[PDB]
Amino acid sequence: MKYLPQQDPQVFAAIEQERKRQHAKIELIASENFVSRAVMEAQGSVLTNKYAEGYPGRRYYGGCEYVDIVEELARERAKQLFGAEHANVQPHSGAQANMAVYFTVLEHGDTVLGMNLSHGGHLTHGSPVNFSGVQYNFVAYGVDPETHVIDYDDVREKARLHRPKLIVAAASAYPRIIDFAKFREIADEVGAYLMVDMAHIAGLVAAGLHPNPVPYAHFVTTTTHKTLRGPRGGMILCQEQFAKQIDKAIFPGIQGGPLMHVIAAKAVAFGEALQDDFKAYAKRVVDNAKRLASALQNEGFTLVSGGTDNHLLLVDLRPQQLTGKTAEKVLDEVGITVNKNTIPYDPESPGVTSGIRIGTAAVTTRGFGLEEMDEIAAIIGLVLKNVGSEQALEEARQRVAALTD
Amino acid sequence: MKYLPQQDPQVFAAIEQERKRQHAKIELIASENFVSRAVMEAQGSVLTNKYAEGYPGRRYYGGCEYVDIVEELARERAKQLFGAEHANVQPHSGAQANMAVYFTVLEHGDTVLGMNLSHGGHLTHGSPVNFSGVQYNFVAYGVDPETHVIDYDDVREKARLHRPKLIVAAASAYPRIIDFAKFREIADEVGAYLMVDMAHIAGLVAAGLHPNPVPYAHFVTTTTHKTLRGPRGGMILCQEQFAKQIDKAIFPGIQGGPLMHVIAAKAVAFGEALQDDFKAYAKRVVDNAKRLASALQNEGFTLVSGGTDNHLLLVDLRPQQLTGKTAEKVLDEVGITVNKNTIPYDPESPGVTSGIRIGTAAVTTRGFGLEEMDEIAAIIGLVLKNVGSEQALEEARQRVAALTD
């Protein structure tokens, strides 16, 4: 940076602290990643100056010839990545992407069937304090109490009982592959639309390491950040039959002017994901997650579903008689960033929890591999087995520092 | 840029075209501006990498110590700028800011009273194709057919007849000062909340050149872009009594993770607005608008309301027997960017219109002054009086080029 340090010392000092923090800590929050310098440059461009309500070639302001090229690059690259018939790259966030799909097919009070929030479903999949649960009548399907895998017979029973207009598949804390074919079969049986929210797994889908929901879902929503490793924002994919309605849902439905600089950054991120080296990256993400899971089990930890098929895992801390809150706190003391997370059938409140959620996308981006996964697991074991020992925590602190340099 | 040109030639080439376009053209779209290099740098920072759901000191993820400093700088500087008791700097856009306020105080189907959309009201103030008009029962007040000033007796009558739960004041195309005191008096009479959407005029309010709605409104929404000259995004100001509810409306109500890099940019823009030179800038904006209005009238144009009190003006093209669409098109041919805009009591459809909307915020930022306003008016006269003369358009083209270099 050249101008910010002189113009705004206060803001610059805080940004620099954050930059140094991002290097120093071991980032295991499953939704986190580190974008490329090219992505950041695109976000830091003069494109922020342009109003471009509408769509490429169909804008409500003149002078959009070049931002049109940018938006079309984003849309076409997205279609290439996911094999979707249509892309909308304007959603401001994952929340807004979901909001738009709901706005498209649902009326106020319509019934929607989503994943139980305490079993891995997202806030926007029906929380009573979120617009989703307030505007629509959400019902939930669960995971099996033993295997922690989605109970597809429960999905089916809930669908047949409640007759939802829409079924939502996908999760913020589900460590196994989701069977989109079965979701569509159930949807077809009850005459419901199927929406898949692939936010967490989008990068893995792009790399062919998780089955693609696009062929099975009427609508696919996603964040552009997370495993896709793009800028912060949302996206909708859908078949051509819903393209016009989806576009109208985003604008003039729920948003105004799009963030053209962020859309530029989306294009850049999609370009990166199209490359062979992103596929290798995504494989290392999944390989690292498996290794970390196995190494944690070797340290004596119990994992929800007994492991992982993707980028993330959930530790069930009940055998250690620890809450997620306690674990999150003490790991923060040593420079490991996780979040407390409700486990399926958690006896604890969402404010306390019995689990921690861990993902490997960020550390993989930093170049961590199998050996590092072993060490992270060993440090986590050292910490959580010795929460009352300042010397153990100091050793952990030093070992964390050794990993990040 | 260093990395984008090598990583993504296609995206870079388009961005460079856009950058050159922004310099070459005379930007008169009233919502447009040019942000500082410091603002762009903040948006292009590593802060995009951080999940920070929640609020400063009350986040749902660890490691937010530094982004907390950034968000608090934004909130405190906003409070300083506008004298508000509370600020929420997380809204992704003006649309989302408005959405959140509606979510806070209204239930589905509640009656809201806003400015007639064809008289200057915004899309999010009740368009039947926008969530606002779909989710709530919007009724409208109008401007006087002669003076084109808001008819406050009509505001009062509509309020007393329809008994709205909420009254919205503010506009996307209203060239005169809005009387917030009268709006609050009417609101008090019918027991309605008052929301002021100051998006267009926020920079002028900050500079003391338009009366401040904060003392009179329960809620004030705004964009951070437009006359405020900040990054693309939204903000809500309110009294302390609504702070908790407003914050909950934004999250977990309508959004997820905030855009921390954009919030950094918001802080930077607010810092800039706090400086004496921004006040001088804003005065030049209003001075330029007055000069441009007078110069246009000298060229024989009729203006809606007979002039301007702010940054924007509306030309009523009926005396010239031209539509807004025709005028917008031919001005585009010579490098002047305006938008067609419905005028009050327009005999034409929104797709055609009888007016063009013009604002001076962008050209003022580029350093244009009174002499330049005279020349812009003269060029507009040359063009619109000679739409069929390629030689006149070429002369105009050359005079536009002379202004921008």
Tab-separated table of N, CA, C and O in Angstrom, chain A residues 1-4 7-8 10 14 17 21-22 29 31-35 37 40-41 43-46 48-51 61 63 66 70 77 92-93 96 99 108 129-131 135 225-226 232 252-254 258-259 261 268 272 275, chain B residues 1-4 7-8 10 14 17 21-22 29 31-35 37 40-41 43-51 61 63 66 70 77 92-93 96 99 108 129-131 135 225-226 232 252-254 258-259 261 268 272 275:
chain	number	residue	atom	x	y	z
A	1	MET	N	0.842	-1.232	0.000
A	1	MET	CA	0.000	0.000	0.000
A	1	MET	C	0.859	1.257	0.000
A	1	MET	O	1.907	1.303	0.652
A	2	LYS	N	0.403	2.279	-0.714
A	2	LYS	CA	1.137	3.536	-0.782
A	2	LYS	C	0.396	4.702	-0.130
A	2	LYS	O	1.012	5.527	0.550
A	3	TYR	N	-0.918	4.762	-0.338
A	3	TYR	CA	-1.709	5.939	0.025
A	3	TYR	C	-2.399	5.834	1.378
A	3	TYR	O	-2.469	6.818	2.118
A	4	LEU	N	-2.899	4.642	1.694
A	4	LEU	CA	-3.560	4.388	2.975
A	4	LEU	C	-2.696	4.696	4.215
A	4	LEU	O	-3.198	5.308	5.158
A	7	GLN	N	-2.758	8.531	4.502
A	7	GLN	CA	-4.110	9.064	4.649
A	7	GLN	C	-4.768	8.692	5.980
A	7	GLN	O	-5.433	9.523	6.609
A	8	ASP	N	-4.580	7.447	6.407
A	8	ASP	CA	-5.296	6.932	7.564
A	8	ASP	C	-4.411	5.999	8.389
A	8	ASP	O	-4.542	4.776	8.298
A	10	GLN	N	-4.529	5.174	11.491
A	10	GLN	CA	-5.318	4.304	12.372
A	10	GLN	C	-5.810	3.048	11.654
A	10	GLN	O	-5.584	1.932	12.130
A	14	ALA	N	-4.270	-1.041	11.994
A	14	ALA	CA	-5.157	-2.173	12.277
A	14	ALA	C	-5.082	-3.241	11.182
A	14	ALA	O	-5.040	-4.445	11.479
A	17	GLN	N	-1.836	-5.137	11.612
A	17	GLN	CA	-1.984	-6.106	12.701
A	17	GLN	C	-2.698	-7.363	12.194
A	17	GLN	O	-2.278	-8.486	12.489
A	21	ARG	N	-1.380	-11.127	12.028
A	21	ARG	CA	-2.186	-12.150	12.694
A	21	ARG	C	-2.441	-13.336	11.753
A	21	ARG	O	-2.245	-14.495	12.137
A	22	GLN	N	-2.848	-13.043	10.517
A	22	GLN	CA	-3.157	-14.094	9.537
A	22	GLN	C	-1.960	-15.014	9.261
A	22	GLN	O	-2.139	-16.198	8.987
A	29	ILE	N	-10.548	-22.484	11.167
A	29	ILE	CA	-11.975	-22.241	10.938
A	29	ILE	C	-12.321	-22.702	9.522
A	29	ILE	O	-11.715	-22.261	8.541
A	31	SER	N	-14.553	-22.333	7.285
A	31	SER	CA	-15.021	-21.429	6.225
A	31	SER	C	-13.939	-20.483	5.696
A	31	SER	O	-14.172	-19.751	4.718
A	32	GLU	N	-12.778	-20.485	6.346
A	32	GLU	CA	-11.732	-19.506	6.049
A	32	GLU	C	-10.788	-19.965	4.946
A	32	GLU	O	-10.604	-21.166	4.724
A	33	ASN	N	-10.190	-18.989	4.272
A	33	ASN	CA	-9.156	-19.246	3.277
A	33	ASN	C	-8.306	-17.985	3.077
A	33	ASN	O	-8.543	-16.957	3.728
A	34	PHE	N	-7.305	-18.069	2.205
A	34	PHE	CA	-6.493	-16.900	1.863
A	34	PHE	C	-6.512	-16.698	0.351
A	34	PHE	O	-6.065	-17.561	-0.410
A	35	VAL	N	-7.063	-15.570	-0.079
A	35	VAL	CA	-7.163	-15.281	-1.514
A	35	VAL	C	-5.823	-14.829	-2.081
A	35	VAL	O	-4.939	-14.386	-1.345
A	37	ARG	N	-3.129	-12.554	-4.398
A	37	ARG	CA	-2.887	-11.130	-4.598
A	37	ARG	C	-3.672	-10.574	-5.798
A	37	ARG	O	-4.166	-9.450	-5.739
A	40	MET	N	-7.276	-9.845	-4.687
A	40	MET	CA	-7.291	-8.602	-3.915
A	40	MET	C	-7.140	-7.360	-4.801
A	40	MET	O	-7.884	-6.394	-4.644
A	41	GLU	N	-6.211	-7.407	-5.754
A	41	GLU	CA	-6.046	-6.302	-6.705
A	41	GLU	C	-7.328	-5.968	-7.463
A	41	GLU	O	-7.674	-4.793	-7.617
A	43	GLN	N	-10.416	-6.528	-6.426
A	43	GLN	CA	-11.300	-5.887	-5.432
A	43	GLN	C	-10.904	-4.450	-5.131
A	43	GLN	O	-11.749	-3.644	-4.753
A	44	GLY	N	-9.616	-4.149	-5.274
A	44	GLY	CA	-9.086	-2.822	-4.989
A	44	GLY	C	-9.065	-1.915	-6.208
A	44	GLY	O	-8.363	-0.904	-6.213
A	45	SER	N	-9.837	-2.272	-7.236
A	45	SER	CA	-9.834	-1.542	-8.510
A	45	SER	C	-10.857	-0.407	-8.560
A	45	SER	O	-11.729	-0.293	-7.694
A	46	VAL	N	-10.760	0.413	-9.608
A	46	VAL	CA	-11.705	1.514	-9.843
A	46	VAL	C	-13.126	1.048	-10.199
A	46	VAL	O	-14.024	1.874	-10.364
A	48	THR	N	-15.237	-0.160	-8.360
A	48	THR	CA	-16.143	0.260	-7.286
A	48	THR	C	-16.916	1.529	-7.682
A	48	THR	O	-18.028	1.757	-7.196
A	49	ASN	N	-16.337	2.318	-8.591
A	49	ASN	CA	-16.938	3.590	-9.021
A	49	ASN	C	-18.158	3.454	-9.952
A	49	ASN	O	-18.834	4.448	-10.229
A	50	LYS	N	-18.440	2.246	-10.440
A	50	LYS	CA	-19.436	2.088	-11.506
A	50	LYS	C	-20.777	1.517	-11.045
A	50	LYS	O	-20.830	0.402	-10.511
A	51	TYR	N	-21.849	2.279	-11.270
A	51	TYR	CA	-23.211	1.745	-11.132
A	51	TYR	C	-23.555	0.910	-12.355
A	51	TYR	O	-23.412	1.362	-13.499
A	61	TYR	N	-27.879	1.769	-16.809
A	61	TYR	CA	-26.966	2.912	-16.960
A	61	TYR	C	-26.069	2.706	-18.178
A	61	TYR	O	-25.689	1.573	-18.484
A	63	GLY	N	-22.381	3.325	-20.305
A	63	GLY	CA	-20.968	3.211	-19.965
A	63	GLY	C	-20.554	1.886	-19.344
A	63	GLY	O	-19.468	1.787	-18.774
A	66	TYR	N	-17.410	-2.218	-20.410
A	66	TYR	CA	-16.243	-2.931	-19.885
A	66	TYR	C	-16.546	-3.758	-18.639
A	66	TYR	O	-16.071	-4.895	-18.519
A	70	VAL	N	-16.338	-7.968	-17.836
A	70	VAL	CA	-15.952	-8.549	-16.548
A	70	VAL	C	-17.020	-9.501	-15.986
A	70	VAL	O	-16.705	-10.635	-15.598
A	77	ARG	N	-17.012	-18.375	-16.878
A	77	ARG	CA	-16.056	-19.199	-16.128
A	77	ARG	C	-16.752	-20.045	-15.064
A	77	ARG	O	-16.362	-21.190	-14.831
A	92	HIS	N	-24.477	-10.387	-3.169
A	92	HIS	CA	-23.507	-9.738	-2.273
A	92	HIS	C	-22.848	-10.708	-1.284
A	92	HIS	O	-21.794	-10.410	-0.723
A	93	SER	N	-23.487	-11.855	-1.074
A	93	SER	CA	-23.088	-12.802	-0.035
A	93	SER	C	-23.808	-14.131	-0.247
A	93	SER	O	-24.735	-14.213	-1.049
A	96	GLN	N	-27.477	-13.529	0.716
A	96	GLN	CA	-28.253	-12.916	-0.362
A	96	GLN	C	-28.534	-13.865	-1.524
A	96	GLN	O	-29.605	-13.794	-2.125
A	99	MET	N	-31.338	-15.909	-0.145
A	99	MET	CA	-32.490	-15.012	-0.088
A	99	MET	C	-33.172	-14.890	-1.448
A	99	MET	O	-34.408	-14.919	-1.536
A	108	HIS	N	-44.510	-15.934	1.096
A	108	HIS	CA	-44.483	-15.797	2.548
A	108	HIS	C	-45.295	-16.919	3.197
A	108	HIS	O	-46.451	-17.137	2.836
A	129	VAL	N	-34.414	-16.714	14.123
A	129	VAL	CA	-33.926	-15.328	14.241
A	129	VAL	C	-33.327	-14.817	12.920
A	129	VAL	O	-32.790	-13.702	12.850
A	130	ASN	N	-33.436	-15.640	11.883
A	130	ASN	CA	-33.002	-15.278	10.535
A	130	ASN	C	-34.230	-15.056	9.662
A	130	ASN	O	-35.296	-15.625	9.934
A	131	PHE	N	-34.097	-14.240	8.617
A	131	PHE	CA	-35.232	-13.978	7.731
A	131	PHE	C	-35.855	-15.289	7.212
A	131	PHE	O	-37.067	-15.367	7.021
A	135	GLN	N	-39.758	-15.687	7.613
A	135	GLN	CA	-40.525	-15.477	6.386
A	135	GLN	C	-41.174	-16.761	5.876
A	135	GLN	O	-42.250	-16.723	5.263
A	225	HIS	N	-16.178	-17.203	-1.591
A	225	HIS	CA	-15.142	-17.499	-0.610
A	225	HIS	C	-15.374	-18.918	-0.060
A	225	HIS	O	-16.307	-19.607	-0.505
A	226	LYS	N	-14.539	-19.323	0.897
A	226	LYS	CA	-14.501	-20.685	1.485
A	226	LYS	C	-13.588	-21.600	0.635
A	226	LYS	O	-12.503	-21.162	0.249
A	232	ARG	N	-15.038	-12.377	-0.977
A	232	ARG	CA	-16.251	-12.537	-0.192
A	232	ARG	C	-17.482	-12.134	-1.019
A	232	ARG	O	-17.592	-10.997	-1.471
A	252	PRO	N	-34.576	-6.518	-10.156
A	252	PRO	CA	-34.795	-5.593	-9.032
A	252	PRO	C	-35.349	-6.187	-7.724
A	252	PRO	O	-35.801	-5.434	-6.858
A	253	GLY	N	-35.296	-7.510	-7.561
A	253	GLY	CA	-35.926	-8.158	-6.410
A	253	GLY	C	-35.357	-7.809	-5.039
A	253	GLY	O	-36.036	-7.192	-4.218
A	254	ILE	N	-34.109	-8.199	-4.789
A	254	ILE	CA	-33.553	-8.109	-3.436
A	254	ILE	C	-32.323	-7.198	-3.281
A	254	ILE	O	-31.996	-6.792	-2.160
A	258	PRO	N	-24.837	-3.925	-8.251
A	258	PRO	CA	-23.879	-4.979	-7.898
A	258	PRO	C	-22.501	-4.392	-7.573
A	258	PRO	O	-22.218	-3.240	-7.920
A	259	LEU	N	-21.662	-5.179	-6.903
A	259	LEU	CA	-20.310	-4.751	-6.570
A	259	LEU	C	-19.379	-5.192	-7.700
A	259	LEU	O	-18.870	-6.305	-7.701
A	261	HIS	N	-16.337	-4.450	-8.751
A	261	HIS	CA	-14.970	-4.800	-8.348
A	261	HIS	C	-14.892	-6.204	-7.720
A	261	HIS	O	-13.948	-6.959	-7.976
A	268	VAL	N	-11.597	-13.572	-11.437
A	268	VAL	CA	-10.207	-13.961	-11.189
A	268	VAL	C	-10.143	-15.304	-10.446
A	268	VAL	O	-9.435	-16.226	-10.868
A	272	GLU	N	-8.632	-18.946	-11.601
A	272	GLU	CA	-7.691	-19.731	-10.799
A	272	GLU	C	-8.199	-21.155	-10.579
A	272	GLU	O	-7.419	-22.105	-10.677
A	275	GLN	N	-7.716	-23.790	-13.341
A	275	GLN	CA	-6.343	-24.268	-13.567
A	275	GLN	C	-6.092	-25.612	-12.899
A	275	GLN	O	-6.677	-25.915	-11.853
B	1	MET	N	-1.172	-2.074	-10.317
B	1	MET	CA	-1.324	-3.543	-10.103
B	1	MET	C	-0.082	-4.299	-10.554
B	1	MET	O	0.536	-3.948	-11.564
B	2	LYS	N	0.267	-5.347	-9.817
B	2	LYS	CA	1.435	-6.150	-10.158
B	2	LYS	C	1.083	-7.576	-10.575
B	2	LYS	O	1.676	-8.113	-11.515
B	3	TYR	N	0.121	-8.179	-9.878
B	3	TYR	CA	-0.155	-9.610	-10.012
B	3	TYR	C	-1.288	-9.941	-10.974
B	3	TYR	O	-1.207	-10.923	-11.717
B	4	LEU	N	-2.333	-9.117	-10.959
B	4	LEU	CA	-3.479	-9.294	-11.851
B	4	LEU	C	-3.127	-9.312	-13.353
B	4	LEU	O	-3.637	-10.166	-14.078
B	7	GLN	N	-1.630	-12.805	-13.948
B	7	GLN	CA	-2.556	-13.881	-13.605
B	7	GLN	C	-3.770	-13.956	-14.535
B	7	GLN	O	-4.196	-15.047	-14.929
B	8	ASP	N	-4.322	-12.798	-14.883
B	8	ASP	CA	-5.578	-12.753	-15.617
B	8	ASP	C	-5.583	-11.610	-16.631
B	8	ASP	O	-6.183	-10.562	-16.383
B	10	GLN	N	-7.243	-11.210	-19.351
B	10	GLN	CA	-8.605	-10.853	-19.770
B	10	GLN	C	-9.269	-9.872	-18.804
B	10	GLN	O	-9.752	-8.818	-19.225
B	14	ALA	N	-9.916	-5.570	-19.335
B	14	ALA	CA	-11.238	-4.965	-19.144
B	14	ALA	C	-11.212	-3.873	-18.071
B	14	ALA	O	-11.815	-2.803	-18.248
B	17	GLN	N	-9.560	-0.809	-19.553
B	17	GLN	CA	-10.524	-0.105	-20.403
B	17	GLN	C	-11.450	0.761	-19.543
B	17	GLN	O	-11.710	1.922	-19.873
B	21	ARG	N	-11.942	4.721	-19.555
B	21	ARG	CA	-13.299	5.229	-19.756
B	21	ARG	C	-13.654	6.269	-18.685
B	21	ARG	O	-14.145	7.358	-19.005
B	22	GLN	N	-13.377	5.945	-17.421
B	22	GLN	CA	-13.701	6.845	-16.305
B	22	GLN	C	-13.018	8.213	-16.433
B	22	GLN	O	-13.569	9.224	-16.002
B	29	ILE	N	-23.976	11.021	-14.142
B	29	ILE	CA	-24.941	10.207	-13.398
B	29	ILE	C	-24.871	10.603	-11.924
B	29	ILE	O	-23.805	10.560	-11.302
B	31	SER	N	-25.656	9.514	-9.039
B	31	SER	CA	-25.232	8.599	-7.969
B	31	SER	C	-23.737	8.269	-7.994
B	31	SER	O	-23.229	7.601	-7.075
B	32	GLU	N	-23.047	8.712	-9.041
B	32	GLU	CA	-21.657	8.313	-9.267
B	32	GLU	C	-20.659	9.236	-8.581
B	32	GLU	O	-20.942	10.413	-8.338
B	33	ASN	N	-19.488	8.683	-8.287
B	33	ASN	CA	-18.370	9.452	-7.754
B	33	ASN	C	-17.056	8.708	-8.018
B	33	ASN	O	-17.058	7.623	-8.619
B	34	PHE	N	-15.940	9.297	-7.602
B	34	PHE	CA	-14.640	8.631	-7.713
B	34	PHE	C	-13.979	8.582	-6.338
B	34	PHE	O	-13.693	9.620	-5.735
B	35	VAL	N	-13.771	7.372	-5.835
B	35	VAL	CA	-13.170	7.203	-4.508
B	35	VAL	C	-11.663	7.430	-4.552
B	35	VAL	O	-11.039	7.347	-5.612
B	37	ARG	N	-7.587	6.770	-3.689
B	37	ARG	CA	-6.696	5.616	-3.732
B	37	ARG	C	-6.627	4.890	-2.379
B	37	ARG	O	-6.565	3.663	-2.344
B	40	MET	N	-9.675	2.574	-2.061
B	40	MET	CA	-9.450	1.381	-2.878
B	40	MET	C	-8.445	0.415	-2.240
B	40	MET	O	-8.693	-0.788	-2.184
B	41	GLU	N	-7.339	0.947	-1.724
B	41	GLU	CA	-6.356	0.116	-1.020
B	41	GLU	C	-6.959	-0.668	0.143
B	41	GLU	O	-6.672	-1.856	0.309
B	43	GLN	N	-10.117	-1.598	0.447
B	43	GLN	CA	-10.945	-2.647	-0.179
B	43	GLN	C	-10.119	-3.792	-0.743
B	43	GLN	O	-10.605	-4.916	-0.835
B	44	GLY	N	-8.885	-3.492	-1.141
B	44	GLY	CA	-7.991	-4.479	-1.732
B	44	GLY	C	-7.107	-5.170	-0.707
B	44	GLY	O	-6.097	-5.773	-1.070
B	45	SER	N	-7.489	-5.088	0.568
B	45	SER	CA	-6.675	-5.623	1.667
B	45	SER	C	-6.997	-7.079	2.006
B	45	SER	O	-7.993	-7.639	1.541
B	46	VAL	N	-6.155	-7.675	2.852
B	46	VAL	CA	-6.356	-9.050	3.333
B	46	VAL	C	-7.574	-9.214	4.257
B	46	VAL	O	-7.884	-10.327	4.680
B	47	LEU	N	-8.255	-8.114	4.578
B	47	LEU	CA	-9.438	-8.199	5.447
B	47	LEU	C	-10.570	-9.025	4.828
B	47	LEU	O	-11.452	-9.498	5.539
B	48	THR	N	-10.529	-9.214	3.505
B	48	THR	CA	-11.503	-10.082	2.835
B	48	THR	C	-11.428	-11.518	3.381
B	48	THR	O	-12.423	-12.249	3.347
B	49	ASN	N	-10.262	-11.891	3.914
B	49	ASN	CA	-10.033	-13.251	4.425
B	49	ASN	C	-10.722	-13.571	5.766
B	49	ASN	O	-10.733	-14.729	6.190
B	50	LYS	N	-11.284	-12.563	6.435
B	50	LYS	CA	-11.748	-12.754	7.814
B	50	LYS	C	-13.264	-12.865	7.966
B	50	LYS	O	-13.997	-11.937	7.602
B	51	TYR	N	-13.719	-13.991	8.520
B	51	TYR	CA	-15.111	-14.114	8.973
B	51	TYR	C	-15.275	-13.400	10.306
B	51	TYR	O	-14.519	-13.638	11.256
B	61	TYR	N	-16.686	-15.627	15.991
B	61	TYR	CA	-15.391	-16.243	15.667
B	61	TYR	C	-14.276	-15.557	16.454
B	61	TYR	O	-14.338	-14.349	16.691
B	63	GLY	N	-10.180	-14.320	16.909
B	63	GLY	CA	-9.214	-13.638	16.058
B	63	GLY	C	-9.691	-12.329	15.450
B	63	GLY	O	-9.073	-11.823	14.514
B	66	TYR	N	-8.495	-7.189	15.585
B	66	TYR	CA	-8.059	-6.093	14.716
B	66	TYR	C	-9.148	-5.599	13.769
B	66	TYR	O	-9.301	-4.385	13.579
B	70	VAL	N	-11.112	-1.808	13.343
B	70	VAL	CA	-11.551	-1.239	12.066
B	70	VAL	C	-13.050	-0.900	12.056
B	70	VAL	O	-13.436	0.218	11.683
B	77	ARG	N	-16.535	7.145	13.694
B	77	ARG	CA	-16.406	8.228	12.711
B	77	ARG	C	-17.753	8.587	12.085
B	77	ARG	O	-18.021	9.761	11.827
B	92	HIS	N	-24.488	-4.521	3.295
B	92	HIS	CA	-23.768	-4.767	2.037
B	92	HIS	C	-24.037	-3.703	0.964
B	92	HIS	O	-23.269	-3.567	0.011
B	93	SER	N	-25.133	-2.971	1.127
B	93	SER	CA	-25.623	-2.045	0.107
B	93	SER	C	-26.701	-1.146	0.705
B	93	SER	O	-27.178	-1.398	1.809
B	96	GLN	N	-29.800	-3.362	1.195
B	96	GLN	CA	-29.746	-4.147	2.429
B	96	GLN	C	-29.933	-3.309	3.691
B	96	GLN	O	-30.538	-3.781	4.652
B	99	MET	N	-33.634	-2.817	3.709
B	99	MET	CA	-34.205	-4.125	4.021
B	99	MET	C	-34.177	-4.403	5.522
B	99	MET	O	-35.160	-4.904	6.087
B	108	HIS	N	-44.839	-8.607	7.702
B	108	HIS	CA	-45.323	-8.853	6.349
B	108	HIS	C	-46.722	-8.259	6.174
B	108	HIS	O	-47.616	-8.530	6.975
B	129	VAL	N	-42.038	-4.751	-8.094
B	129	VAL	CA	-41.088	-5.794	-8.521
B	129	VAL	C	-39.866	-5.871	-7.591
B	129	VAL	O	-38.920	-6.631	-7.840
B	130	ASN	N	-39.906	-5.083	-6.522
B	130	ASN	CA	-38.872	-5.095	-5.490
B	130	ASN	C	-39.435	-5.744	-4.231
B	130	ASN	O	-40.654	-5.720	-4.013
B	131	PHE	N	-38.567	-6.321	-3.401
B	131	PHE	CA	-39.031	-6.965	-2.172
B	131	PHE	C	-39.903	-6.010	-1.332
B	131	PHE	O	-40.849	-6.447	-0.678
B	135	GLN	N	-43.405	-7.379	-0.143
B	135	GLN	CA	-43.460	-7.785	1.260
B	135	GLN	C	-44.345	-6.868	2.100
B	135	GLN	O	-44.965	-7.310	3.076
B	225	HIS	N	-21.302	5.035	-0.749
B	225	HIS	CA	-20.970	5.657	-2.023
B	225	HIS	C	-21.986	6.779	-2.305
B	225	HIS	O	-22.870	7.034	-1.471
B	226	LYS	N	-21.855	7.414	-3.470
B	226	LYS	CA	-22.642	8.598	-3.897
B	226	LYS	C	-21.964	9.892	-3.388
B	226	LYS	O	-20.742	10.004	-3.498
B	232	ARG	N	-18.527	1.143	-2.203
B	232	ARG	CA	-19.888	0.689	-2.435
B	232	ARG	C	-20.392	-0.128	-1.236
B	232	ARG	O	-19.814	-1.154	-0.885
B	252	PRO	N	-28.307	-11.711	13.271
B	252	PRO	CA	-28.523	-12.739	12.240
B	252	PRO	C	-29.739	-12.567	11.313
B	252	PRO	O	-30.118	-13.519	10.625
B	253	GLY	N	-30.332	-11.373	11.265
B	253	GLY	CA	-31.573	-11.171	10.516
B	253	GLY	C	-31.493	-11.365	9.006
B	253	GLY	O	-32.098	-12.289	8.460
B	254	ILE	N	-30.744	-10.498	8.327
B	254	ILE	CA	-30.779	-10.465	6.862
B	254	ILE	C	-29.446	-10.764	6.157
B	254	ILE	O	-29.440	-11.091	4.964
B	258	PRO	N	-20.007	-10.000	7.493
B	258	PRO	CA	-19.822	-8.674	6.894
B	258	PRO	C	-18.574	-8.634	6.005
B	258	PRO	O	-17.710	-9.513	6.106
B	259	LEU	N	-18.493	-7.627	5.138
B	259	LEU	CA	-17.338	-7.457	4.266
B	259	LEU	C	-16.332	-6.554	4.980
B	259	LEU	O	-16.398	-5.336	4.887
B	261	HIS	N	-13.127	-5.806	4.690
B	261	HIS	CA	-12.324	-4.938	3.821
B	261	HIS	C	-13.112	-3.703	3.346
B	261	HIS	O	-12.572	-2.595	3.283
B	268	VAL	N	-12.173	4.674	6.153
B	268	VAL	CA	-11.307	5.601	5.421
B	268	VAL	C	-12.125	6.765	4.840
B	268	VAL	O	-11.784	7.937	5.036
B	272	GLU	N	-12.021	10.792	5.648
B	272	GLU	CA	-11.909	11.828	4.620
B	272	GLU	C	-13.023	12.865	4.749
B	272	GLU	O	-12.762	14.063	4.623
B	275	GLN	N	-12.695	15.694	7.336
B	275	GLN	CA	-11.697	16.737	7.053
B	275	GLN	C	-12.335	17.989	6.468
B	275	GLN	O	-13.348	17.911	5.765
